[PDB]
Each structure stands twice: as structure tokens, then as C-alpha cells.
Design an enzyme around this catalytic site. Structure first.
Site, PDB file in Angstrom:
ATOM      1  N   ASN A 239      -8.437  10.183  -0.999  1.00  0.00           N
ATOM      2  CA  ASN A 239      -8.957   9.407  -2.103  1.00  0.00           C
ATOM      3  C   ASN A 239      -8.407   7.978  -1.972  1.00  0.00           C
ATOM      4  OD1 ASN A 239      -8.687  12.199  -4.444  1.00  0.00           O
ATOM      5  ND2 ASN A 239     -10.526  11.306  -3.641  1.00  0.00           N
TER       6      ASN A 239
ATOM      7  N   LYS B  80      -1.193  -5.915   6.152  1.00  0.00           N
ATOM      8  CA  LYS B  80      -0.015  -6.251   5.353  1.00  0.00           C
ATOM      9  C   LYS B  80       1.289  -5.998   6.031  1.00  0.00           C
ATOM     10  CE  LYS B  80      -2.711  -5.291   1.261  1.00  0.00           C
ATOM     11  NZ  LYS B  80      -2.507  -5.656  -0.155  1.00  0.00           N
TER      12      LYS B  80
ATOM     13  N   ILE C 123      -3.693  -2.915  -3.148  1.00  0.00           N
ATOM     14  CA  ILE C 123      -4.226  -4.023  -3.895  1.00  0.00           C
ATOM     15  C   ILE C 123      -5.174  -4.757  -2.955  1.00  0.00           C
ATOM     16  CG2 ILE C 123      -3.725  -6.143  -5.075  1.00  0.00           C
ATOM     17  CD1 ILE C 123      -0.886  -4.918  -5.691  1.00  0.00           C
TER      18      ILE C 123
ATOM     19  N   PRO D 199       0.828  -1.220   0.000  1.00  0.00           N
ATOM     20  CA  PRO D 199       0.000   0.000   0.000  1.00  0.00           C
ATOM     21  C   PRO D 199       0.849   1.251   0.000  1.00  0.00           C
ATOM     22  CG  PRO D 199      -0.914  -1.557   1.512  1.00  0.00           C
ATOM     23  CD  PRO D 199       0.398  -2.128   1.080  1.00  0.00           C
TER      24      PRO D 199
END
Ligand SMILES: CS(=O)(=O)Nc1cc2occ(NC=O)c(=O)c2cc1Oc1ccccc1
Lengths: 114, 114, 114
Positions: B97, B32, B64, B1
Site C-alpha cells: 500500500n 532522497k 512525502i 520515507p
């Protein structure tokens, strides 16, 4: 296409000719005229990758088409290669986000490409 | 990320340890390993929010997966919390966002995650 | 909505009132209230367009809705027009990427808009 590189590598470590090299190589790799290629490099950034401040890069490639599985692997080899050779950034400290842009969502010269 | 914060807060107001804190908190929140988390803070920006130049931030989180309705509410509480505590930015002057990236569209280590 | 402009035009060439003008004109064009508009201008950038370092810009407009064929044409005419008048950038040296954000993918004030 538009390629943006954000890095903690210092400005003085960006060699002369880097933007032109990226423009040319991206033209070649996307099969598009160079007139369409925009490049942007942002050094001296406050960033970490895996918590380390060792050299790293966060990049984006946007294109109207020419984005997909295999193509993106080939762009990543090309681009991590340039970043490693020119900026001495390890490929495992690079993320490149790829964006397949719809023509209607790309503005240029007072309109869009739709 | 990958988490990016662009702010008009000055560089001296970013505390030492902030990038490490974001790395750890995002590793936890995304579930993660921290080796995969990249963080990028861009202070001193020419910015307004609602037409005012009071402290504000424009941010992005790419992952992801691990992106969705409830998750993103949780991330927004976390990240606005950190921006308020550490940078003294009001939560109502923050936009974040969220991007759920396809593994084929993320380049890393000469290839992609596909 | 959020509008970002990255440019090689120097900071001193960005006039007073530019952010406020962008805010107002975006509110006019998108219909969104000015309280919801965030604007960000990044001058002094290392960028090229078509392999040239003449004045250029790479921009982004994100909005929950109000993105589409005709709307985006209208935004581009507006925004290229402002860039040309205020920053002396030719419209053919501007790219603007448009993003229709899902409400669940925009964080603000500790939550999202979903
Ligand atoms: C700027 S925007 O593009 O992110 N859109 C908006 C921003 C807003 O900000 C503040 C608000 N309330 C109090 O402040 C909002 O309700 C709000 C609503 C926005 O739009 C919509 C439209 C339909 C569905 C969901 C969101």
C-alpha cells in the site's frame, strides 16, 4: 484516537505505566475523554532509521478530527518528548504519521461513528 | 520515507544486511538521502493470502511526495524483486500500500515537516 | 482486500481456522474473490483501550473500493461479531480503520492495479 508506536527498544526497557501515561497525555492533548483513547506499543522490532539500528520509532496517530498543522506540531513535541524520556529514543529518530479519519471510516461497537 | 514489511517468513530467513539493502535501494528509488529512509521488517507473522499460509507479505510505503502511477509501478517491481530474491516470497503473494503523506501530517524531531 | 487485527488476546486463545474464517467472511461481505483477500492476526500485544487492558483490538481494512457508509457499518458488525465469538473481545473495545485505496496506490505481482 488511536496511537501506535513500533520500536526496536526491548520490552524490558518499556517502563511500567507507559500505556497509561500515553492514554492520559493523549486525552489531554486531543481534548477528548480517555475512554476514546487506544494505545499500542510494539517493542523488539527489527527496524532501522537512516540505516542505523540505534533506538528509533515509527508511529501513527489516527483521530476523527483534531488533526492539522499546528495541532500535529504540538502532538509531535508531546510524543517525541515521551519517547525520549521513557524509551531513550532521540526525537530525530522518530516518525509519526498523522491520520484525520472520516467518521464513516472508523468502526466501533458493531457500527461506525458516522 | 518509511517502508514496512509484515511476513510469515521466519526471522532466521531474513538475511543479514536486508534492512541496509532496503535502505539503500529506497534512497535510490525515491531520490532522497538515506538519512530519511526508515525500514521495518516483521517476520514470523500469522498470515494468509488467498486463504493459503505459503510465504506472503503485506507492506506499506509512505513518502512525502514521490508517489504516483508510474513511480508506484517502479517501486512495486523493485520491492517485489527484493522480497522474492531475499525472502523467497512470490510477487503474486505481496501487497504494497502506497501513501503520499502531506508534510504537515508527518511528525519528526518534536515538530512536523510542514 | 487486506485485514489486520492487533490484539492483547494471547496466541493460544486464537482458534484454529480463524484466518480461514476471516478470509471467507470477508470475501462474503466485500464481494471480492477469496484469492484477493489477505488476513493478518497479531496476538499478545501490549495495548490499552480507554486506559484499560481488558481484551481489545485495533484493526484495519484496506480495499480498492467497496468502502463507504453502509458497507463499513456492515463490516463492523461482521468483524466485531467474529472478534466477540472467537476471541471474546467486547465490540465496544474494537476500533477498525477503513481505507479506500486508489488502484494506483496498491502494488502486487511487480506492478500496481492502475
Ligand atoms: C484485493 S483488492 O482490494 O487489492 N482489489 C483487487 C485485487 C486483485 O488482485 C488480483 C487481480 N488479478 C489477478 O489476480 C486483480 O485483478 C485484482 C483486482 C482488485 O480490485 C480492483 C478493482 C477495480 C480496479 C482495480 C482493482
Amino acid at each position: 484516537p488511536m496511537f501506535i508506536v513500533n520500536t526496536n527498544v526491548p520490552r524490558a526497557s518499556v517502563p511500567d505505566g507507559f500505556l497509561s501515561e500515553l492514554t492520559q497525555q493523549l486525552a489531554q492533548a486531543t481534548g477528548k475523554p480517555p475512554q476514546y483513547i487506544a494505545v499500542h506499543v510494539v517493542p523488539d522490532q527489527l527496524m532501522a532509521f537512516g540505516g542505523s539500528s540505534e533506538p528509533c520509532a515509527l508511529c501513527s496517530l489516527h483521530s476523527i478530527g483534531k488533526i492539522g498543522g499546528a495541532q500535529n506540531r504540538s502532538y509531535s513535541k508531546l510524543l517525541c518528548g515521551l519517547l525520549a524520556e521513557r524509551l531513550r529514543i532521540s526525537p530525530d529518530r522518530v516518525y509519526i504519521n498523522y491520520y484525520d479519519m472520516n467518521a464513516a471510516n472508523v468502526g466501533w461497537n458493531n457500527s461506525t461513528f458516522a
